Structure 1
């Protein structure tokens, strides 16, 4: 019996009591064991877990944030599920409840009394204070935002607030002795029910709680009818219209654990069983989501219906969402800073080389652009979802992943039109035509055709990319129906695959032979140029890139060791009909048309991003002023850093504003079918966050 049990952290004795009886009800059913640690508060529980004196604790969104900061760096592993089994949900609503009779609105709360669940809590603090910020006249740090709130409401109860500094924030609290304004059950006006009671007793005029509270504490439509909700559009509405009248939709509470060795498996298994044996209306003995007559929400939310496992790739920031995560951060910043962040564009670069060019561009951007980075394209997508970065140009294959994650396309890379336009002046409005995905091979391997490419050595720009992967693998998968992608070719270089896999054999990493198969420019065989090089150096027999890639790296067009002497004539294209044509005939010999690369971003940065990039390219574009005098956005010496060097300009999407519409139904269907074989951690995570 190696595992002794999962160590749960309680924050009160009544919680510890419910814990201990959970422990015995567990072994009584012979299920996974669970012990109980005792502490005074969430942060104590958070610390206890970070230093191995405990394993799990469930926290509100506000503390999930805290719990995720250094040195704790805890992770949300399971989310509470609310609603009904018919329509479950891993989120709830932060609303403002008031009694019928008054007439004030959400914008007329000054001088009135308020009831909060507790300091730093989602519904009780972070959401309402964030929503009311423009009425607070707060001047920003180092002046605590609390002081501003203390001057806004004539009085209130904010469990946990500093009684000495902000006595006004505790004035309404009903706790006796040193328990007044206590962040615990001792304070009768603590948490959702507490803050709600504070409203009923008349101590306050407005309570900031979740949508269910009124339905949980009031069993009788008659009473519920004495209450209303303050909607952000400054109007009132029935307490059952929260879906149309809430201050914010927020992620449910979640059990958190260490990221080091958190024993996620143990916790999940314990929660999985506990949910079935003592879950919602399961056993009469013990009840996981129920509490005594004088208690509420002990260990978990009362009336919650179960747990939902949280995908491994999700950290606290990702779990909280772009909006909420940054909203919390914005509570600790002046309005000048927030507005400044709202105006700048944080590009994310993949790898050091892209980072170097980004910084170079940042310095010449006049404060409009700054940089961030990760070692893979997906990590960057994660950084954008967290608000730590805002934009990047992606291959169509990635636009798909970015789309499933909620990001949208904003501008596309435009290439030289089907035929001569002469440094086009209307490049910005010339619809994109896509580029040609082809399969290149050496002229000399005369017997190599498309019908016999299987089993050979392959070169791919990277896994999940259009020309290099989605199209060639999709064509082959359509034939065999086999998901065993790593057997399509004897061996290859497909950056982004498993290093121990044959899909990585041919890769060569960088000069030191490091970063083998890494999906960024450090791997010399990465991307278009990298995949072609993989062929030109006889590493592979076929390379899946686009047509203009050969042209650019042959006939002196690229003066680099490996490509200095390569000639266009020494390469051919494999057509789907078995024929072999010269690269110059790609127009009638290509695997498929691929949608252009596009710049993606969050919906909230679209307009700003669009005007910044348009200004920036006018300055450093193909025919920009400062290029090549000072800097050129679309140049990186055949490195295709940040953008494709053959980018004429960034153009408008003419309506194709979503990934589904930009990539097109067919390509999207094709990719989806390809994903059935396997999904990445990013997609797994985004699927979870979209539910």
Structure 2
């Protein structure tokens, strides 16, 4: 994006300043130049960027946290990347290691012996302790002038918490003398130390990082375990699904309301003229043969290989993820201890209307569920990723995204009050997507390029998303238009070949290509007629043939129509009888489901099953409020929802959606991803 601006990098050390001007010298010659301002505290720097003296700095997981807090809401615009065998990464993970065979899981740390890395260390203090604070377990609430932080003594019978000088049982298990055992360097300190402690039977849990079991014990790793927050243990290598939280990489941060593009543009050029391989000398990351301590990690970590940009919708809170953010809430902010799941659900709504209905919900449930409001589905997910909201009913599409953002399906919407409902329920009954055609057994799926297709409307499942998704799987281009010769896809941009055949209102002038019933070929029906007047391939749902053909639609285009006139295009290449669906289909698009974070999952489940007994299709109080009836239509649930099918514990979105739909969407979305899927993709790393 175009300028000739300087960028004021901030340094807090002279050494740092040293390479900062070394940097600038290398490219006085470019559009976006650099400036160096040194200060004493990262923190000053923070405020020196909130007041516009400066432009960017590289923060640490916890630093970047407070840089985000008002009055400076500086946001991470760029993070580092670090791997060797694997590829690349924007993270590391703290674990709680236990010994295999001792049989306690996370509720049971009350009165354990613990081994830690040091006081005020993220891995060994902040994460575990703050977690255990938010859950309840360590009961710390309101430090105004309440004796405080080292209350963990009341929780754990003994510990080894290095460099603590405020208690004594926390110093108890430290190996050494007495004066040196609780020193910050007292030998059970740091990572390895905390591990040895545990190996010395001096703990029950060493709160550490993942690599440690390989680092200290690669022989006997198999004797050790992880203690996860869902109340389970998992082996050493299952860390990615068992971490207490992943101190997401070092972030360059800057102002929201500013010239960030310029800074990323400098970091960009710099990043790799003078990169990981500089043909010669100024390095921007240069890490070896143990250099002097004050030399290393100036400006960026030397470990770094790569500076990757942050998706613009990202904020401190999202980047750091949940886990860490809330751990830092706990100790870094107030004493907050009897509410992990404060047994009562913030349902997150879209649009005032939705709110109104949720307000009804609120009331009649006697406040079991409370309500938040937004302007978007986009947004409600973020309030769910951020723990400001709990659950939302999502569409098949939305589900994928949220599922990528780690929201798991809970109850799926079923629309037949007669089929899948309790015992009755097996999985909720989706509908199909199928490409219908006529006689000419010339046409097949893999030969479809360049034919004339008719589509329901763009942005719709049936007519647009599934065919085009699948098709893009095959092509690798976001070419849409330029795949078929021409066809109809309502609301296409009128120069688009997929507006060529559209007839608008009959053919009297008016609305040649609108996605509305003021267009001749709109909807499933319109498109079935569109196979009939002009198109070669129709993309629709499986009920469309058998809803208009043999004396079902009495419009003149349809008058002589009967089902052997239309066949199904199978994906495998073959064709079939319209009347033959579960076997021949493009995709079986599942219902809406509600998603939340895994933690909220099983209670959400209960909420609704209760709420339904009272306000669903044969509810106890349904005269006050019908959970499923709306003042308009799809207000919270899909108006002609019948019952709420329980999906079994920990369902993957992928399972819920099935391989066909999952493939459709995933491919369609490599084309032009939205802001939210982008971030959820970056934090699939997290």
- TM-score range normalised by the length of the shorter chain: 0.5 to 0.7
- What aligned pairs does 1:330-341 form with structure 2 within 5 A after superposition? 330-331=330-331, 332-333=333-334, 335=336, 338-339=339-340, 341=341
Residue segments in structure 1 that go unaligned for 5+ positions in a row? 98-104, 159-166, 173-197, 216-223, 441-449, 507-522, 553-566
- What aligned pairs does 1:81-160 form with structure 2 within 5 A after superposition? 81-84=81-84, 87-94=87-94, 115-116=118-119, 122-123=122-123, 126-131=126-131, 133=133, 137-142=139-144, 147-148=149-150
Q: Which residue of 2 aligns with 1:389?
A: 389
How far apart, in 1, do the equivalents of 2:4 and 2:144 lie?
A: 47
Give the 3 Å change call, closer, same or farther, for CA 425–395 of structure 1 in structure 2: closer
Q: Deviations over 1:209-237 (max 9, x none)?
A: 6x6xx79xxxxxxxx98997999962597
Q: Which residue of 2 aligns with 1:606?
A: 601
- What aligned pairs does 1:169-568 form with structure 2 within 5 A after superposition? 202-203=183-184, 205=186, 234=205, 239-240=215-216, 248-271=245-268, 273-277=270-274, 279=276, 283-284=280-281, 288-289=285-286, 292-331=292-331, 332-333=333-334, 335=336, 338-339=339-340, 341-416=341-416, 426=422, 429-436=425-432, 460=457, 463=459, 466-467=461-462, 469-474=464-469, 483-485=478-480
Q: Which residue of 2 aligns with 1:597?
A: 592
Give the 3 Å change call, closer, same or farther, for CA 631–150 of structure 1 in structure 2: closer
Give the 3 Å change call, closer, same or farther, for CA 525–372 of structure 1 in structure 2: farther
Q: Deviations over 1:137-189 (max 9, x none)?
A: 4233445796446988999759xxxxxxxx959xx9xxxxxxxxxxxxxxxxx
How far apart, in 2, do the equivalents of 1:289 and 1:407 lie?
A: 39
Q: Tell me the CA shift for residue 654 of structure 1.
A: 5.1
How far apart, in 1, do the equivalents of 2:466 and 2:116 lie?
A: 62
How far apart, in 1, do the equivalents of 2:346 and 2:184 lie?
A: 46
How far apart, in 1, do the equivalents of 2:364 and 2:337 lie?
A: 23
Give the 3 Å change call, closer, same or farther, for CA 576–13 of structure 1 in structure 2: farther
Q: Tell me the CA shift for residue 324 of structure 1.
A: 2.2
Q: Which residue of 1 aligns with 2:22?
A: 21
Give the 3 Å change call, closer, same or farther, for CA 255–145 of structure 1 in structure 2: farther
Q: Tell me the CA shift for residue 125 of structure 1.
A: 5.3
**Which of 648, 663, 676 is 2:657 aligned to?**
663
How far apart, in 1, do the equivalents of 2:298 and 2:146 lie?
A: 31
Q: Deviations over 1:494-526 (max 9, x none)?
A: 6xx99999999x9xxxxxxxxxxxxxxxx9979
Q: Does 1:616 align with 2:587?
A: no
Q: 375-384 vs 227-236, which deviates more?
A: 227-236
Q: Deviations over 1:521-553 (max 9, x none)?
A: xx9979xxxx869979x9xx999886899999x
Residue segments in structure 2 that go unaligned for 5+ positions in a row? 98-107, 171-178, 218-225, 227-235, 437-444, 503-513, 569-576
Q: Tell me the CA shift for residue 493 of structure 1.
A: 5.9
Contact persistence 2:362–2:371 (CA under 8 A): yes
Q: Deviations over 1:556-593 (max 9, x none)?
A: xxxxxxxxxxx986697999986499xxx997799753
SS at match of 1:605: helix
SS at match of 2:638: coil
Q: Which residue of 1 aligns with 2:47?
A: 47
Q: Deviations over 1:602-652 (max 9, x none)?
A: 11111111111111111111111121x111111115621211111111112
Q: Which residue of 1 aligns with 2:102?
A: none
Give the 3 Å change call, closer, same or farther, for CA 275–644 of structure 1 in structure 2: same
Root mean square deviation, CA, Å:
5.4
How far apart, in 2, do the equivalents of 1:575 and 1:268 lie?
A: 62
Q: Which residue of 2 aligns with 1:675?
A: 669
SS at match of 1:593: coil
Contact persistence 1:77–1:254 (CA under 8 A): yes
Q: Which residue of 2 aligns with 1:6?
A: 7
Contact persistence 1:8–1:56 (CA under 8 A): yes
Contact persistence 1:436–1:587 (CA under 8 A): no
SS at match of 1:624: coil
Contact persistence 1:413–1:650 (CA under 8 A): yes
Residues matched between the structures, number:
580
Contact persistence 1:322–1:385 (CA under 8 A): yes
How far apart, in 1, do the equivalents of 2:284 and 2:479 lie?
A: 46
Q: Deviations over 1:336-374 (max 9, x none)?
A: 5633x4423222222222222223222333333222333
Q: Does 1:58 align with 2:58?
A: yes
SS at match of 2:609: helix
How far apart, in 2, do the equivalents of 1:660 and 1:33 lie?
A: 47
How far apart, in 2, do the equivalents of 1:580 and 1:113 lie?
A: 68
Contact persistence 1:139–1:334 (CA under 8 A): yes
Q: Which residue of 1 aligns with 2:510?
A: none
SS at match of 1:338: coil
SS at match of 1:604: helix
Q: Tell me the CA shift for residue 333 of structure 1.
A: 4.9
TM-score, normalised with respect to structure 1: 0.67
Give the 3 Å change call, closer, same or farther, for CA 479–65 of structure 1 in structure 2: closer
SS at match of 1:91: coil
Q: Tell me the CA shift for residue 412 of structure 1.
A: 0.9
Q: Tell me the CA shift for residue 375 of structure 1.
A: 2.8
SS at match of 2:644: strand
Q: Tell me the CA shift for residue 667 of structure 1.
A: 2.1
Contact persistence 1:272–1:307 (CA under 8 A): no
How far apart, in 2, do the equivalents of 1:365 and 1:309 lie?
A: 46
Q: Deviations over 1:114-146 (max 9, x none)?
A: 84467xxx4475324315636754233445796
How far apart, in 1, do the equivalents of 2:382 and 2:541 lie?
A: 28
Give the 3 Å change call, closer, same or farther, for CA 314–363 of structure 1 in structure 2: same
How far apart, in 2, do the equivalents of 1:532 and 1:609 lie?
A: 35
How far apart, in 1, do the equivalents of 2:321 and 2:298 lie?
A: 26
How far apart, in 2, do the equivalents of 1:144 and 1:501 lie?
A: 69
SS at match of 2:666: helix
SS at match of 2:142: coil
How far apart, in 1, do the equivalents of 2:493 and 2:376 lie?
A: 14
